[PDB]
Design a protein around this motif. Structure first.
Motif, PDB file in Angstrom:
ATOM      1  N   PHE A  55     -82.797 -37.211  87.910  1.00  0.00           N
ATOM      2  CA  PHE A  55     -83.578 -35.976  87.945  1.00  0.00           C
ATOM      3  C   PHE A  55     -82.655 -35.050  88.768  1.00  0.00           C
ATOM      4  CE2 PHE A  55     -88.439 -36.373  87.272  1.00  0.00           C
ATOM      5  CZ  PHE A  55     -88.349 -37.538  86.565  1.00  0.00           C
ATOM      6  N   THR A  56     -82.508 -33.821  88.355  1.00  0.00           N
ATOM      7  CA  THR A  56     -81.714 -32.664  88.835  1.00  0.00           C
ATOM      8  C   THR A  56     -82.267 -32.205  90.157  1.00  0.00           C
ATOM      9  OG1 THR A  56     -81.232 -31.632  86.789  1.00  0.00           O
ATOM     10  CG2 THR A  56     -81.411 -30.185  88.667  1.00  0.00           C
ATOM     11  N   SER A  57     -83.627 -32.381  90.237  1.00  0.00           N
ATOM     12  CA  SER A  57     -84.584 -32.174  91.372  1.00  0.00           C
ATOM     13  C   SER A  57     -86.070 -32.366  90.977  1.00  0.00           C
ATOM     14  CB  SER A  57     -84.476 -30.808  91.945  1.00  0.00           C
ATOM     15  OG  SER A  57     -85.054 -29.888  91.052  1.00  0.00           O
TER      16      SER A  57
ATOM     17  N   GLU B 124     -80.828 -34.746  76.944  1.00  0.00           N
ATOM     18  CA  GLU B 124     -79.752 -35.710  76.765  1.00  0.00           C
ATOM     19  C   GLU B 124     -78.457 -35.140  77.314  1.00  0.00           C
ATOM     20  OE1 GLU B 124     -78.981 -37.335  72.889  1.00  0.00           O
ATOM     21  OE2 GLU B 124     -77.252 -38.459  73.625  1.00  0.00           O
ATOM     22  N   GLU B 125     -77.704 -35.965  78.082  1.00  0.00           N
ATOM     23  CA  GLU B 125     -76.388 -35.689  78.701  1.00  0.00           C
ATOM     24  C   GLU B 125     -75.299 -36.202  77.752  1.00  0.00           C
ATOM     25  OE1 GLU B 125     -75.936 -33.744  81.234  1.00  0.00           O
ATOM     26  OE2 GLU B 125     -73.933 -34.104  80.748  1.00  0.00           O
ATOM     27  N   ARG B 126     -74.495 -35.338  77.150  1.00  0.00           N
ATOM     28  CA  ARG B 126     -73.443 -35.798  76.246  1.00  0.00           C
ATOM     29  C   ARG B 126     -72.103 -36.007  76.948  1.00  0.00           C
ATOM     30  NH1 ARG B 126     -72.173 -34.284  71.063  1.00  0.00           N
ATOM     31  NH2 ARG B 126     -70.146 -35.327  71.295  1.00  0.00           N
TER      32      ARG B 126
ATOM     33  N   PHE C 275     -80.231 -39.980  79.271  1.00  0.00           N
ATOM     34  CA  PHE C 275     -81.293 -38.982  79.378  1.00  0.00           C
ATOM     35  C   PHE C 275     -81.585 -38.674  80.837  1.00  0.00           C
ATOM     36  CE2 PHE C 275     -82.179 -41.744  75.649  1.00  0.00           C
ATOM     37  CZ  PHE C 275     -81.814 -40.831  74.697  1.00  0.00           C
ATOM     38  N   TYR C 276     -81.788 -37.423  81.190  1.00  0.00           N
ATOM     39  CA  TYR C 276     -82.201 -37.052  82.545  1.00  0.00           C
ATOM     40  C   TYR C 276     -83.404 -36.122  82.403  1.00  0.00           C
ATOM     41  CZ  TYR C 276     -79.745 -32.895  81.468  1.00  0.00           C
ATOM     42  OH  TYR C 276     -79.281 -31.872  80.706  1.00  0.00           O
ATOM     43  N   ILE C 277     -84.027 -35.772  83.516  1.00  0.00           N
ATOM     44  CA  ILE C 277     -85.197 -34.858  83.548  1.00  0.00           C
ATOM     45  C   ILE C 277     -84.849 -33.696  84.476  1.00  0.00           C
ATOM     46  CG2 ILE C 277     -87.612 -34.683  84.341  1.00  0.00           C
ATOM     47  CD1 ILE C 277     -87.783 -36.425  82.117  1.00  0.00           C
TER      48      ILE C 277
ATOM     49  N   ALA D 244     -69.088 -39.086  81.627  1.00  0.00           N
ATOM     50  CA  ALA D 244     -68.551 -39.187  82.977  1.00  0.00           C
ATOM     51  C   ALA D 244     -69.304 -38.281  83.933  1.00  0.00           C
ATOM     52  CB  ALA D 244     -67.064 -38.854  82.976  1.00  0.00           C
ATOM     53  N   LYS D 245     -69.992 -37.245  83.435  1.00  0.00           N
ATOM     54  CA  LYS D 245     -70.866 -36.349  84.254  1.00  0.00           C
ATOM     55  C   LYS D 245     -72.066 -37.206  84.634  1.00  0.00           C
ATOM     56  CE  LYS D 245     -72.975 -31.486  83.940  1.00  0.00           C
ATOM     57  NZ  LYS D 245     -71.923 -30.871  84.746  1.00  0.00           N
ATOM     58  N   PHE D 246     -72.614 -37.851  83.623  1.00  0.00           N
ATOM     59  CA  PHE D 246     -73.805 -38.708  83.750  1.00  0.00           C
ATOM     60  C   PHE D 246     -73.536 -39.749  84.805  1.00  0.00           C
ATOM     61  CE2 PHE D 246     -76.725 -42.172  82.490  1.00  0.00           C
ATOM     62  CZ  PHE D 246     -77.900 -41.489  82.672  1.00  0.00           C
ATOM     63  N   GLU D 247     -72.508 -40.515  84.585  1.00  0.00           N
ATOM     64  CA  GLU D 247     -72.214 -41.626  85.485  1.00  0.00           C
ATOM     65  C   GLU D 247     -71.953 -41.133  86.903  1.00  0.00           C
ATOM     66  OE1 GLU D 247     -70.074 -44.371  81.970  1.00  0.00           O
ATOM     67  OE2 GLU D 247     -69.075 -44.047  83.904  1.00  0.00           O
ATOM     68  N   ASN D 248     -71.273 -39.995  87.041  1.00  0.00           N
ATOM     69  CA  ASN D 248     -70.986 -39.479  88.373  1.00  0.00           C
ATOM     70  C   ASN D 248     -72.254 -38.969  89.046  1.00  0.00           C
ATOM     71  OD1 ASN D 248     -69.798 -36.668  89.943  1.00  0.00           O
ATOM     72  ND2 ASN D 248     -68.907 -38.673  90.443  1.00  0.00           N
ATOM     73  N   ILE D 249     -73.161 -38.416  88.255  1.00  0.00           N
ATOM     74  CA  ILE D 249     -74.438 -37.892  88.781  1.00  0.00           C
ATOM     75  C   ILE D 249     -75.302 -39.095  89.181  1.00  0.00           C
ATOM     76  CG2 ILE D 249     -76.613 -37.066  87.936  1.00  0.00           C
ATOM     77  CD1 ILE D 249     -74.028 -34.974  89.128  1.00  0.00           C
ATOM     78  N   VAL D 250     -75.272 -40.166  88.420  1.00  0.00           N
ATOM     79  CA  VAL D 250     -76.120 -41.347  88.717  1.00  0.00           C
ATOM     80  C   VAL D 250     -75.572 -42.030  89.960  1.00  0.00           C
ATOM     81  CG1 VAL D 250     -76.659 -43.683  87.919  1.00  0.00           C
ATOM     82  CG2 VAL D 250     -77.095 -41.765  86.418  1.00  0.00           C
TER      83      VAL D 250
HETATM   84  N1  LIG Z   1     -76.718 -36.651  84.731  1.00  0.00           N
HETATM   85  C1  LIG Z   1     -76.492 -35.671  84.563  1.00  0.00           C
HETATM   86  C2  LIG Z   1     -76.293 -34.401  84.363  1.00  0.00           C
HETATM   87  N2  LIG Z   1     -77.039 -33.325  85.324  1.00  0.00           N
HETATM   88  C3  LIG Z   1     -78.405 -33.085  85.550  1.00  0.00           C
HETATM   89  C4  LIG Z   1     -79.156 -34.149  86.115  1.00  0.00           C
HETATM   90  N3  LIG Z   1     -79.757 -35.243  86.352  1.00  0.00           N
HETATM   91  C5  LIG Z   1     -76.305 -32.548  86.265  1.00  0.00           C
HETATM   92  O1  LIG Z   1     -75.301 -32.379  85.970  1.00  0.00           O
HETATM   93  C6  LIG Z   1     -76.782 -32.049  87.566  1.00  0.00           C
HETATM   94  C7  LIG Z   1     -77.663 -32.617  88.306  1.00  0.00           C
HETATM   95  C8  LIG Z   1     -77.879 -31.983  89.534  1.00  0.00           C
HETATM   96  C9  LIG Z   1     -77.112 -30.914  89.642  1.00  0.00           C
HETATM   97  S1  LIG Z   1     -76.211 -30.727  88.384  1.00  0.00           S
END
Ligand SMILES: N#CCN(CCN)C(=O)c1cccs1
Lengths: 237, 300
Positions: free
Chosen positions: B6-8, B82-84, B67-69, B87-93
């Motif tokens: 979740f982004t927040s 959906e996060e395509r 998938f994120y919310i 590497a953004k996904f994995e780094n965010i997780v």
């Molecule tokens: N995963 C992924 C991609 N995603 C949104 C969130 N869960 C983001 O890139 C950001 C999150 C929080 C600031 S940016």
């Protein structure tokens, strides 16, 4: 929805409708067997399908052979009723088919709706009225044709004789239901009232006697008194 | 074990994940759900604190994408996306797990509840009931109507459950009126199983999905469908033994999981009394009858 005292004049408008009464379809005598058990013996019955505006009665005679080897006969009787009413509707020209069929007993609703799925525009409705159509078998000529039948048969009658030449449908239906209610409450006394005067006969082509207008007033009053009299006898009033 | 970041969390909300739920305060540092078991569909659902009106949520399968919310302040809801960029996904997780900002899917090892509730539910079948082909996940909410409901109003927002109608030409063979109405075996086995669902697994999947939407969203049309699919089997004299035994298990776990204080609204007295005590199958649902009588004896 349901047909009751409030929406009573709808019966006499120009939308074709039929009452269906199934109370005489499955008829039995209950008796003892040689072993001292109880069994039933079926006798011929009828579906009573009536257009209350015109008096046309489609009397479908249910011969006892339709029950041979069948189970759960009281349930089957409802489905057989619906099957025969459906067949009657299909046999009628489009412009003669009913727009509504009013069943006198709510257990007929699902069987009739299911048999009429091919007619989504024909409304199937119950009624809150307690109509005396079970007494149809107290009309001598109807009972006679039912009991004499040796096979399934439809017979057409006008249950109003020639009354609509002189009275409205509303008044004819009121007279019919009064006569039938009296026959249902005290059959012997009602038949005595109708036949007591040797000079008044029933025409070959009629069901009821050929009373003048003033004689119908007397007869109707005598039927009302019979119904009230029996009510008092029943409730000790 | 997969993760939904979740982004927040900007508005106070009760968040559900499958049969679990937790409360998130306004602007609480919440950043998602980890340790989600692979191999099943899941549902992540929401009820806002300031307006418990409209429960809504998303059915998804982490095998089908990342998938994120994130909350949308314009449309006023938490949206699945959906996060395509893997590497953004994995780094965010990874960042959100290191800061311990995620709740763990709290599955007990002995506990097969979720598997038992979703045994026959597949994402591909969900996406045919809920039509929004640009997304790999499916949105459902409390107010969405079914195709059958709509026939008796926006078609794109509909639940396309298989229409079941006992007084319909589809259910009644001409000349078998009494037979087919009193014994629905024709309609069950020929029309529905052989004709429409192809097999009992697809039938049970839709029944199970209907129950879950009824329970998690209070979706009335889904409750209708769930009960119709139960009644269709129970009112059939001829049902394969394996289907009866499986139905008993399915219903047992549905009744076990139902919140006790929602029974008045999620259980149809007529259907359950008919199914358990009058129908052809009144003696074939031993596990379901026992749990119903011990847990909801009032209804019966
Ligand atoms: N995963 C992924 C991609 N995603 C949104 C969130 N869960 C983001 O890139 C950001 C999150 C929080 C600031 S940016």
């Amino acid at each position: 929805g349901a047909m009751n005292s409030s929406n009573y004049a709808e019966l006499f408008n120009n939308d074709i409708k039929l009452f269906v009464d199934d109370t005489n379809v499955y008829r039995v005598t209950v008796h003892k067997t040689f072993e001292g058990n109880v069994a039933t013996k079926a006798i011929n019955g009828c579906i009573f399908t009536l257009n209350p505006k015109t008096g046309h009665l489609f009397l479908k005679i249910i011969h006892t052979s339709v029950w041979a080897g069948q189970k759960r006969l009281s349930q089957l009787a409802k489905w057989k009723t619906a099957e025969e009413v459906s067949a009657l509707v299909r046999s009628l020209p489009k412009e003669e088919q009913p727009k509504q069929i009013i069943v006198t007993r709510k257990a007929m609703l699902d069987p009739l709706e299911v048999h009429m799925l091919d007619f989504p525009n024909i409304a199937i409705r119950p009624t809150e009225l307690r109509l005396p159509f079970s007494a149809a078998m107290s009309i001598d000529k109807l009972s006679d044709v039912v009991m004499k039948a040796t096979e399934p048969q439809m017979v057409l009658f006008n249950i109003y004789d020639d009354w609509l030449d002189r009275i409205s449908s509303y008044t004819a239906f009121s007279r019919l239901t009064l006569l039938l209610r009296a026959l249902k409450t005290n059959e012997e006394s009602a038949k005595m009232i109708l036949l007591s005067d040797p000079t008044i006969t029933i025409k070959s082509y009629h069901l009821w006697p050929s009373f003048t207008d003033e004689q119908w007033i007397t007869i109707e009053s005598q039927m009302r008194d019979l119904i009230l009299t029996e009510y008092g006898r029943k409730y000790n009033v | 074990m997969n993760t939904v970041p979740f982004t927040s969390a900007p508005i106070e909300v009760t968040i559900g994940i499958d049969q679990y739920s937790f409360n998130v305060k306004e602007n609480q540092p919440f950043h998602g759900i980890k340790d989600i078991p692979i191999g099943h569909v899941h549902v992540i659902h929401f009820q806002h604190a300031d307006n418990s009106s409209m429960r809504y949520g998303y059915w998804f399968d982490c095998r089908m994408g990342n998938f994120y919310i994130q909350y949308d302040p314009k449309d006023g809801l938490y949206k699945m996306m959906e996060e395509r960029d893997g590497a953004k996904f994995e780094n965010i997780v990874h960042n959100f797990k290191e800061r311990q900002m995620m709740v763990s899917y709290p599955k007990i090892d002995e506990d097969d509840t979720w598997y038992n509730l979703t045994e026959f539910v597949q994402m591909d079948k969900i996406r045919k009931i809920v039509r929004k082909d640009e997304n790999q996940f499916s949105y459902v909410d409390s107010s969405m109507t079914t195709v059958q409901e709509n026939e008796l109003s926006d078609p794109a927002h509909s639940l396309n459950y298989t229409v079941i109608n006992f007084k319909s030409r589809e259910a009644i063979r001409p000349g078998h009126e009494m037979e087919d109405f009193l014994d629905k075996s024709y309609y069950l086995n020929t029309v529905m199983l052989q004709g429409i669902f192809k097999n009992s697994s697809n039938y049970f999947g839709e029944l199970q999905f209907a129950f879950l939407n009824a329970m998690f969203f209070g979706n009335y049309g889904s409750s209708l469908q769930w009960h119709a699919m139960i009644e269709l089997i129970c009112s059939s004299a001829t049902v394969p033994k394996h289907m009866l035994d499986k139905l008993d298990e399915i219903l047992y776990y549905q009744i076990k999981t139902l919140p006790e204080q929602y029974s008045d609204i999620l259980l149809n007295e007529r259907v359950w009394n008919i199914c358990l005590y009058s129908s052809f199958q009144k003696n074939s649902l031993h596990n379901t009858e026992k749990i119903m009588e011990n847990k909801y004896p009032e209804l019966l």
